[PDB]
């Protein structure tokens, strides 16, 4: 049977080593940050905060 | 030198004196270097006079002039979409009331016959001592000077009328006997309450639309304290 399984084995290895990686950090963050804008200056008044 | 012109003397900028953007171009001959009563339109934008909100502040569009005394056109604080400063709380020095165009009181001394007015020194057709308000308009329009009906307004009753105008370059006077003409005049008066209007003018008279913008102290100054217009 080790001759008949050999091609199935080789195919599973090539897919495993190309599709997979060993985990070393069990949890991963993803974040949503927001943004800022400039405004045009006036002579006397002041801009909005950020 | 020759003239003083209105300026903010105290304006803080953190106490609800606010930046906005203009909704329209400011007229440099008619609205620059004046105290403009302002609101905001249905967008976020400053307008002269009552917008959607009513009067919410005062604005001074400060503009320089060339050595010949004309306004600098290419400014960045006076076109639609330029940013501008509006004050609710502060002081304006070299204060003057704001009025647009020219306005003339006409009154007739004659009780019989006809009288004559001059427009920029050229004489009008004869008008009765009892002409209609419709026939002061028609008389004043009817000379080969190129102004036409489009920039005169007339209102009154036979003894007297007001000839209003949007332009500054037209002057009415008397020229015949039996009629008198006075151009109206505005100058600041000490110890007076000033009032912004839906036109954007600032005057000592509250009519049916006047919204308190401040009080003067000595005539050359205005203490601004806008009683914001409400629904």
Q: Please identify the oligomeric state.
A: part of a larger assembly
Number of helices of chain A: 1
Report the C-alpha radius of gyration of chain A, rounded: 28 Å
Number of strands of chain A: 0
Query: What is the structural class of chain A?
Result: mainly alpha
- Strand percentage of chain B, roughly? 35-45%
Shape of chain A: rod-shaped
Structural class of chain B: mainly beta
Strand percentage of chain A lies at under 5%
**How much is the radius of gyration of chain B in Å?**
20 Å
Helix content of chain A: 25-40%
Cα distance spanning the termini of chain B: 45 Å
What proportion of the residues of chain B is helical, as a percent range? under 10%
Query: What summary fits the major beta sheet of chain A?
Result: none
Tally of separate helices of chain B = 1
Main sheet: strands, sense, barrel of chain B:
6 strands, antiparallel
Strand order of the largest sheet of chain B: 1-7-20-19-17-18
PDB class: virus
Keywords: HK97-fold, T=7, tailed bacteriophage, virus
Entry title: Mycobacterium phage Patience
Chain A: Capsid protein
Topology:
The structure is cut from a larger assembly and holds chains A (50 residues) and B (231 residues).
Chain A: H1 6-19
Chain B: E1 7-11, E2 18-21, E3 35-40, E4 46-48, E5 57-60, E6 83-86, E7 89-93, E8 102-108, E9 114-115, E10 117-119, E11 122-123, E12 127-128, H1 133-141, E13 152-157, E14 160-165, E15 172-174, E16 179-183, E17 193-196, E18 202-203, E19 211-215, E20 221-225
Antiparallel strand pairs in B: 1-7, 2-6, 3-4, 3-5, 7-20, 8-14, 8-16, 9-12, 10-11, 10-15, 13-14, 17-18, 17-19, 19-20
């Amino acid at each position: 049977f080790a001759e008949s399984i050999a091609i199935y084995n080789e195919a599973m290895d090539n897919l495993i080593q190309l599709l997979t990686y060993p985990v070393t950090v069990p949890v991963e963050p993803v974040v949503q940050i927001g943004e800022t804008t400039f405004e045009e200056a006036t002579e006397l008044g002041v801009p909005r905060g950020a | 030198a020759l003239k003083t012109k209105p300026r903010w003397d105290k304006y803080d900028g953190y106490v609800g004196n606010y930046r906005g953007v203009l909704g329209e171009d400011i007229d440099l001959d008619t609205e620059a270097n004046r105290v403009l009563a302002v609101g905001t339109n249905s967008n976020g934008a400053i307008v002269v006079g009552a917008g959607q909100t009513g009067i919410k502040g005062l604005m001074i569009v400060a503009v320089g002039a060339d050595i010949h005394g004309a306004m600098l056109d290419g400014g960045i604080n006076n076109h639609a979409g330029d940013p501008q400063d509006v004050g609710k709380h502060g002081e304006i020095t070299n204060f003057q009331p704001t009025v647009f165009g020219r306005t003339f009181g006409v009154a007739i001394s004659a009780t019989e016959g006809n009288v004559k007015l001059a427009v920029n020194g050229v004489d009008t057709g004869n008008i009765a001592y009892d002409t209609s308000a419709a026939n002061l308009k028609s008389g004043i329009v009817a000379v080969d000077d190129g102004f036409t009906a489009d920039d005169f307004t007339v209102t009154g009753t036979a003894p007297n009328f007001t000839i209003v105008t949007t332009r500054t370059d037209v002057t009415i006077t008397a020229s015949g006997e039996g009629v008198t003409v006075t151009e109206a005049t505005s100058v600041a008066a000490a110890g007076t309450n000033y009032y912004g209007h839906a036109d954007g003018t600032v005057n000592a008279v509250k009519g049916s639309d006047g919204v308190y913008v401040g009080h003067t102290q000595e005539a050359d100054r205005l203490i601004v304290n806008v009683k914001d217009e409400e629904d």
